[PDB]
């Protein structure tokens, strides 16, 4: 149960209504490009979305979304990829009476990602957690930027934030030279020394022989065949600069699979440090987490709703094109979306209530 997992993290006396919309694992396009003369690996995709809301305590019906995060999960015969597509807030968490002044959203993200990792950890299968940190105003909640109480981080702050989010999950395993795990961060435009500054404080006190955080790219881990063309060595996530540049480079193809302007991965990233998304006056983060271990659904809470691909898209798109300019607008949009989800799942209500137990 996801509600139980999240309840163990949140502070004591924190009432939060959650909704977890997913889709059944269905065949999709391969995350990695196929080597020349071969076929793409069969990939099964699985969508996930978490919506965390509270109550301004007018009554009980009063409900406003404070956080939202969309994560894609990929599955092949060798790799399980957990990709954080989007994440955004509305800033109405301020409306919560006696706000504990904790990094709440960070804890929610950590808990959700941990739950997904645990419930999707396959026996003896490499598991990767990838994400693209770009600091922009609003992603999921239109007009939420006009909420003064919304604390929108900057580039550096957001990168450090995601790093702090992933850090515990990383340290839940053994160092790599008994499941192992290592983290990889790449900030376009920054040398290794300047990149190190984004790592959590704990990274300062790790083994020099067996580090946990590395400013590099998991090449020999993601790809068992380093002789394949560079185009087959980079994942092509939806809505990702990596993907766009990979297509732009693939436009140079008629040497099998070899580009013209980019001969290796190093050149690829050197070029990536000067793309339109990574050099618009703001820093950008690339984060990966590699884990190497030597009703058929885990989440059982009422917050969970398994919809078809079509219905999932319908629900999510219904949510992300709403208004959150004011409190009343946010609450109204929350109610409307909740009802729409209830309709798509053929239920009278979707979502569950969670109360934190931890107080340390």
């Amino acid at each position: 149960d996801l509600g139980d997992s999240l309840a163990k993290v949140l502070p004591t006396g924190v009432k939060v209504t959650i909704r977890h919309i997913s889709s059944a694992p269905s065949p999709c396009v391969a995350l990695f490009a196929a080597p020349p003369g071969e076929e793409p690996e069969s990939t099964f995709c699985e969508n996930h979305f978490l919506a965390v809301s509270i109550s301004p305590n007018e009554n009980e019906e009063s409900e406003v979304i404070i956080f939202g995060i969309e994560v894609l999960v990929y599955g092949t015969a060798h790799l399980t990829t957990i990709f954080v597509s989007k994440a955004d807030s509305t800033g109405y968490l301020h409306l919560l009476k006696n706000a504990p002044k904790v990094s709440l959203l960070r804890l929610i993200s950590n808990a959700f990602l941990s739950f997904l990792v645990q419930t999707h950890q396959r026996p003896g299968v490499r598991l990767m957690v990838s994400l693209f940190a770009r600091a922009q105003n609003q992603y999921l909640f239109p007009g939420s930027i006009e909420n003064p109480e919304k604390h929108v981080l900057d580039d550096r702050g957001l990168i450090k934030w995601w790093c702090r989010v992933i850090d515990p999950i990383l340290r839940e395993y053994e160092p790599e030279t008994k499941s192992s795990a290592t983290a990889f961060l790449i900030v376009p435009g920054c040398d290794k020394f300047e990149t190190r500054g984004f790592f959590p404080i704990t990274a300062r006190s790790d083994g020099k022989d067996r580090p946990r955080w590395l400013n590099s790219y998991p090449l020999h881990q993601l790809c068992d065949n380093p002789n394949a063309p560079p185009r087959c060595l980079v994942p092509r996530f939806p809505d990702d600069p990596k993907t766009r540049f990979l297509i732009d480079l693939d436009d140079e193809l008629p040497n099998s699979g070899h580009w013209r302007s980019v001969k290796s991965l190093a050149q690829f990233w050197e070029m990536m440090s000067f793309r339109q998304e990574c050099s618009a006056g703001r820093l950008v983060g690339f984060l990966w987490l590699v884990i190497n271990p030597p009703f058929f659904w885990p989440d059982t809470g009422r917050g969970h709703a398994v919809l078809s691909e079509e219905d999932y898209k319908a629900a999510i798109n219904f949510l992300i094109d709403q208004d959150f300019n004011t409190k009343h607008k946010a609450i109204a949009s929350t109610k409307a979306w909740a009802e729409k989800v209830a309709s798509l799942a053929d239920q009278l209500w979707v979502g569950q209530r969670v109360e934190g137990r931890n107080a340390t």
Binding site: P241, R244, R260, S261, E277
Partner: protein
């Protein structure tokens, strides 16, 4: 009312964005500039691509600085002086 235009609201951003400037005009522009520099060299398509990426990134950042400059003048509409100020703010190109 010199032709002031209000831009469409950005309801939600995205992490990857296609370049806004059309490729052929940018290409013929680059070719013109290359001619004016008096050289018999030409750029690869990938090179012109990178050029466009850099140009548009520069323009977006400069427009951010321009908007900020227009804000501190207590205005919503950006002007030419705001652009010049943003340029000087960057450190002149």
């Amino acid at each position: 009312k010199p032709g002031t235009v209000a831009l469409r609201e950005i309801r939600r951003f995205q992490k990857s964005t296609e370049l806004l400037i059309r490729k052929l005009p940018f290409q013929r522009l680059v070719r013109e500039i290359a001619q004016d520099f008096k050289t018999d060299l030409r750029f690869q398509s990938s090179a012109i691509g990178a050029l466009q990426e850099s140009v548009e990134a520069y323009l977006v950042s400069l427009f951010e600085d321009t908007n900020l400059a227009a804000i501190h003048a207590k205005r919503v509409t950006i002007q030419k002086k705001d652009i010049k100020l943003a340029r000087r703010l960057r450190g002149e190109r």
